Design a protein around this nucleic acid. Structure first.
Length: 48
RNA sequence: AAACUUUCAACAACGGAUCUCUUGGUUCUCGCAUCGAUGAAGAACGCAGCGAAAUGCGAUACGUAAUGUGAAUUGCAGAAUUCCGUGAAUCAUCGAAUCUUUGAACGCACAUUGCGCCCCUUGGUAUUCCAGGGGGCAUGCCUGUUUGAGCGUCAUU
Protein backbone atom coordinates (compact mmCIF):
# COMPACT_ATOMS: atom_id res chain seq x y z
CA UNK A 1 0.00 0.00 0.00
CA UNK A 2 1.03 3.60 -0.61
CA UNK A 3 1.62 6.05 2.23
CA UNK A 4 -1.03 8.79 2.28
CA UNK A 5 -0.04 11.63 4.60
CA UNK A 6 -3.29 13.44 3.75
CA UNK A 7 -6.77 12.04 4.38
CA UNK A 8 -8.18 13.92 1.36
CA UNK A 9 -8.48 12.19 -2.02
CA UNK A 10 -8.08 14.38 -5.10
CA UNK A 11 -8.86 13.75 -8.75
CA UNK A 12 -5.71 12.32 -10.39
CA UNK A 13 -3.92 14.15 -13.18
CA UNK A 14 -4.49 12.49 -16.56
CA UNK A 15 -3.18 13.16 -20.05
CA UNK A 16 -5.02 15.77 -22.13
CA UNK A 17 -4.65 15.54 -25.91
CA UNK A 18 -4.88 18.50 -28.27
CA UNK A 19 -7.58 18.50 -30.93
CA UNK A 20 -6.73 16.84 -34.26
CA UNK A 21 -9.82 17.44 -36.41
CA UNK A 22 -10.39 15.42 -39.57
CA UNK A 23 -11.98 18.39 -41.37
CA UNK A 24 -11.56 22.14 -41.08
CA UNK A 25 -14.06 24.26 -39.17
CA UNK A 26 -14.68 26.65 -42.08
CA UNK A 27 -12.01 25.81 -44.73
CA UNK A 28 -11.78 29.47 -45.82
CA UNK A 29 -10.34 32.02 -43.36
CA UNK A 30 -12.15 35.35 -43.36
CA UNK A 31 -10.34 38.41 -44.65
CA UNK A 32 -9.40 41.32 -42.38
CA UNK A 33 -12.68 42.65 -41.00
CA UNK A 34 -11.06 46.01 -40.08
CA UNK A 35 -8.49 47.14 -42.63
CA UNK A 36 -7.28 50.72 -43.10
CA UNK A 37 -10.04 51.61 -45.57
CA UNK A 38 -12.77 50.44 -43.17
CA UNK A 39 -11.32 52.18 -40.10
CA UNK A 40 -11.25 55.60 -41.80
CA UNK A 41 -14.57 56.36 -43.49
CA UNK A 42 -14.46 60.00 -44.63
CA UNK A 43 -13.01 63.33 -43.46
CA UNK A 44 -15.25 65.84 -41.71
CA UNK A 45 -15.25 69.21 -43.48
CA UNK A 46 -17.37 71.41 -41.22
CA UNK A 47 -16.31 75.00 -40.62
CA UNK A 48 -15.38 74.21 -37.01
C1' A B 1 -93.42 101.13 -40.24
C1' A B 2 -88.45 98.74 -39.16
C1' A B 3 -85.53 95.53 -36.20
C1' C B 4 -86.45 90.80 -34.23
C1' U B 5 -88.98 85.70 -34.42
C1' U B 6 -91.00 81.81 -37.37
C1' U B 7 -92.39 79.04 -42.18
C1' C B 8 -91.12 78.11 -47.65
C1' A B 9 -88.10 78.76 -52.21
C1' A B 10 -83.46 80.05 -54.92
C1' C B 11 -78.19 80.78 -54.49
C1' A B 12 -74.18 80.34 -51.13
C1' A B 13 -72.29 77.75 -46.32
C1' C B 14 -71.69 73.68 -42.76
C1' G B 15 -71.43 68.41 -42.88
C1' G B 16 -70.27 63.71 -45.60
C1' A B 17 -75.52 60.75 -46.20
C1' U B 18 -77.06 58.65 -50.93
C1' C B 19 -75.89 56.46 -55.84
C1' U B 20 -72.18 54.19 -58.69
C1' C B 21 -67.21 52.16 -58.26
C1' U B 22 -63.38 47.91 -55.73
C1' U B 23 -55.59 45.15 -56.51
C1' G B 24 -59.89 43.87 -49.82
C1' G B 25 -62.65 40.48 -46.66
C1' U B 26 -65.50 35.94 -45.89
C1' U B 27 -67.05 30.85 -46.92
C1' C B 28 -66.73 26.15 -49.80
C1' U B 29 -63.82 22.75 -52.84
C1' C B 30 -59.13 20.57 -54.93
C1' G B 31 -53.77 19.40 -54.74
C1' C B 32 -49.08 19.23 -52.01
C1' A B 33 -45.69 18.11 -47.18
C1' U B 34 -40.81 21.73 -46.82
C1' C B 35 -38.28 25.12 -39.87
C1' G B 36 -33.77 24.83 -36.47
C1' A B 37 -26.59 23.85 -33.40
C1' U B 38 -24.89 23.46 -41.60
C1' G B 39 -27.53 28.66 -35.82
C1' A B 40 -34.57 28.74 -36.74
C1' A B 41 -38.89 31.89 -35.47
C1' G B 42 -38.22 36.66 -33.26
C1' A B 43 -35.41 41.27 -31.76
C1' A B 44 -31.80 45.46 -32.24
C1' C B 45 -28.84 48.62 -35.28
C1' G B 46 -27.37 49.88 -40.03
C1' C B 47 -27.29 50.06 -45.93
C1' A B 48 -29.72 54.31 -51.81
C1' G B 49 -26.90 60.46 -56.03
C1' C B 50 -31.10 63.02 -53.59
C1' G B 51 -35.47 58.49 -48.25
C1' A B 52 -38.79 59.54 -42.97
C1' A B 53 -42.19 55.10 -43.36
C1' A B 54 -43.45 50.50 -45.98
C1' U B 55 -40.81 46.83 -48.95
C1' G B 56 -35.75 44.72 -49.87
C1' C B 57 -30.95 43.85 -48.07
C1' G B 58 -26.20 43.04 -44.35
C1' A B 59 -19.87 46.66 -44.15
C1' U B 60 -19.95 42.39 -50.99
C1' A B 61 -25.71 46.06 -47.29
C1' C B 62 -33.17 48.60 -52.08
C1' G B 63 -27.61 44.23 -53.35
C1' U B 64 -22.87 40.19 -55.52
C1' A B 65 -22.54 35.55 -58.74
C1' A B 66 -25.26 32.27 -62.07
C1' U B 67 -29.44 31.22 -65.75
C1' G B 68 -33.46 33.19 -68.91
C1' U B 69 -35.68 37.19 -71.58
C1' G B 70 -33.64 40.96 -75.42
C1' A B 71 -33.65 47.21 -74.51
C1' A B 72 -34.84 49.82 -70.54
C1' U B 73 -35.14 52.78 -65.61
C1' U B 74 -38.14 57.28 -64.82
C1' G B 75 -39.91 62.28 -59.66
C1' C B 76 -35.37 64.84 -61.07
C1' A B 77 -30.35 64.46 -61.93
C1' G B 78 -26.83 61.33 -64.04
C1' A B 79 -24.65 57.44 -66.86
C1' A B 80 -24.79 56.95 -72.00
C1' U B 81 -21.97 52.45 -75.35
C1' U B 82 -25.41 48.90 -72.53
C1' C B 83 -28.14 48.36 -78.49
C1' C B 84 -27.00 43.06 -85.39
C1' G B 85 -25.02 42.06 -78.16
C1' U B 86 -21.59 37.16 -72.96
C1' G B 87 -26.21 42.68 -73.10
C1' A B 88 -30.44 47.66 -70.75
C1' A B 89 -33.70 46.31 -66.64
C1' U B 90 -36.80 48.83 -59.08
C1' C B 91 -37.48 42.40 -65.03
C1' A B 92 -38.00 37.06 -64.38
C1' U B 93 -35.61 32.72 -62.63
C1' C B 94 -32.30 31.13 -58.84
C1' G B 95 -28.80 25.64 -57.86
C1' A B 96 -22.98 29.83 -56.15
C1' A B 97 -21.75 33.44 -52.17
C1' U B 98 -22.05 37.43 -48.56
C1' C B 99 -24.93 37.36 -44.15
C1' U B 100 -23.28 43.45 -38.73
C1' U B 101 -25.03 42.87 -32.99
C1' U B 102 -28.29 39.20 -31.12
C1' G B 103 -31.65 35.30 -30.24
C1' A B 104 -32.77 27.56 -28.34
C1' A B 105 -27.48 30.89 -28.12
C1' C B 106 -22.63 27.87 -26.74
C1' G B 107 -15.43 30.99 -23.02
C1' C B 108 -17.53 33.85 -18.30
C1' A B 109 -20.87 37.82 -17.83
C1' C B 110 -24.84 41.53 -19.54
C1' A B 111 -29.39 47.83 -16.33
C1' U B 112 -21.74 46.89 -18.61
C1' U B 113 -21.18 47.44 -26.29
C1' G B 114 -17.79 44.48 -19.08
C1' C B 115 -13.73 40.47 -18.14
C1' G B 116 -10.66 35.88 -19.19
C1' C B 117 -7.82 31.52 -21.48
C1' C B 118 -5.50 28.68 -25.71
C1' C B 119 -3.05 28.26 -31.00
C1' C B 120 -0.82 30.65 -35.40
C1' U B 121 1.07 35.31 -37.14
C1' U B 122 2.72 40.85 -37.25
C1' G B 123 4.78 45.35 -34.74
C1' G B 124 6.80 47.66 -30.33
C1' U B 125 15.33 46.59 -28.67
C1' A B 126 10.19 40.47 -26.09
C1' U B 127 8.17 32.48 -24.41
C1' U B 128 6.70 36.41 -19.55
C1' C B 129 4.45 43.24 -20.97
C1' C B 130 1.35 46.01 -24.68
C1' A B 131 -1.15 46.15 -29.40
C1' G B 132 -3.17 44.49 -34.66
C1' G B 133 -5.02 40.30 -37.86
C1' G B 134 -6.76 35.09 -38.31
C1' G B 135 -8.61 30.42 -35.68
C1' G B 136 -10.67 28.33 -31.01
C1' C B 137 -12.71 27.21 -25.39
C1' A B 138 -21.19 25.61 -23.22
C1' U B 139 -24.25 21.35 -21.25
C1' G B 140 -26.54 16.22 -21.16
C1' C B 141 -25.92 11.65 -23.80
C1' C B 142 -24.00 7.53 -27.40
C1' U B 143 -19.87 4.68 -29.85
C1' G B 144 -14.73 4.55 -30.07
C1' U B 145 -9.41 6.36 -28.61
C1' U B 146 -6.07 7.65 -24.85
C1' U B 147 -4.59 8.55 -19.91
C1' G B 148 -5.92 6.83 -15.05
C1' A B 149 -8.38 5.42 -9.95
C1' G B 150 -10.09 1.27 -6.15
C1' C B 151 -6.53 -5.05 -1.15
C1' G B 152 -13.49 -5.09 -6.16
C1' U B 153 -10.20 -8.86 -7.85
C1' C B 154 -6.85 -12.99 -10.92
C1' A B 155 -2.23 -14.92 -12.18
C1' U B 156 2.96 -14.58 -11.77
C1' U B 157 7.65 -12.58 -9.30
Amino acid sequence: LKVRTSATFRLPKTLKLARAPKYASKAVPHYNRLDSYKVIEQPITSET
